[PDB]
Amino acid sequence: GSPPGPPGGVVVRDIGDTTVQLSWSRNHSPIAKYTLQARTPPSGKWKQVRTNPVNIEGNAETAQVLGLMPWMDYEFRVSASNILGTGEPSGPSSRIRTKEAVPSVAPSGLSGGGGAPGELTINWTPMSREYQNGDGFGYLLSFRRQGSSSWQTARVPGADTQYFVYSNDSIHPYTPFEVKIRSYNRRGDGPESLTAIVYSAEEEPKVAPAKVWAKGSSSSEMNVSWEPVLQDMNGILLGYEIRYWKAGDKEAAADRVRTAGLDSSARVTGLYPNTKYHVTVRAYNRAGTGPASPSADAMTMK
């Protein structure tokens, strides 16, 4: 008069990407219903699963499991119930992996810009394993000159791929491109991102600020001002990079701070009291920095 013993020999066949066919067998006591559970090893908790048929009769030895995730590891087990309640669950089936599916989201964070002459640089956020949905994962980039119709594409494998640089001598500086990205795996292509406008590399700055003024404003702070670099048409300027170092130290070891905008002055903090500093300023954009200004000097107060 004990609750029914667990069935045994739980095995899996007909593995889909979202379903499997589970089988088992028994054996004296009448069984009214079977209940099925699944977990994702090794550290997953046992959870209930949807079945077809919805109710597994006591004479049944097979059930379709519904509502699984693609490319996922699962173990399954079965329990038997009658008027005396439910017995212990079976031992778990041997681990299976559901089939792969195309990835289900588009990569995010698509952008780009910068690089060397003749380059188009493109960047994005790599997709974490939870959305990859299969092995042989990678990204498919499509790009064309803004205005044109024909796409060029680039297929790059590896989920950790987070940028791509293309170069062609026919690409002029700061050329606008339409760009879009989709992920893919062994099973096929995922959905495409919104299109982004990405400019090819601009020319790096070629001119230095002509004059820099630096003055210690306290024992640990310095105000720095300079003459802006005159932008000629086509010229791109994002801001300035200020470098400063103690007299007696190597220029190459200078700290670096950047502005962003048309400001022609900056405040530098965290300096040492009663100390002489050298300061240079240079222009920058996404292609790099220009040559340095003549150095200026300043002393922090006592």
UniProtKB/Swiss-Prot annotation:
In conjunction with another transmembrane protein, CNTNAP2, contributes to the organization of axonal domains at nodes of Ranvier by maintaining voltage-gated potassium channels at the juxtaparanodal region. A motif (Cell attachment site) lies at residues 187-189. Keywords: Cell adhesion, Cell membrane, Disulfide bond, Glycoprotein, GPI-anchor, Immunoglobulin domain, Lipoprotein, Membrane, Repeat, Signal. Its main location: membrane. One of its GO terms (cellular component) is juxtaparanode region of axon. Residues 6-101, 106-203, 208-302 form the Fibronectin type-III domain. The chain holds residues 609 to 911 of 1040 of the full protein. It comes from Mus musculus (Mouse). It is found in: Cell membrane. Belongs to the immunoglobulin superfamily. Contactin family. One of its GO terms (molecular function) is cell adhesion mediator activity. GO terms for biological process: adult walking behavior; axon guidance; axonal fasciculation; central nervous system myelination; central nervous system neuron differentiation; cerebral cortex GABAergic interneuron migration; clustering of voltage-gated potassium channels; establishment of localization in cell. This is Contactin-2. It comes from the Eukaryota. Glycans are attached at N168, N223.
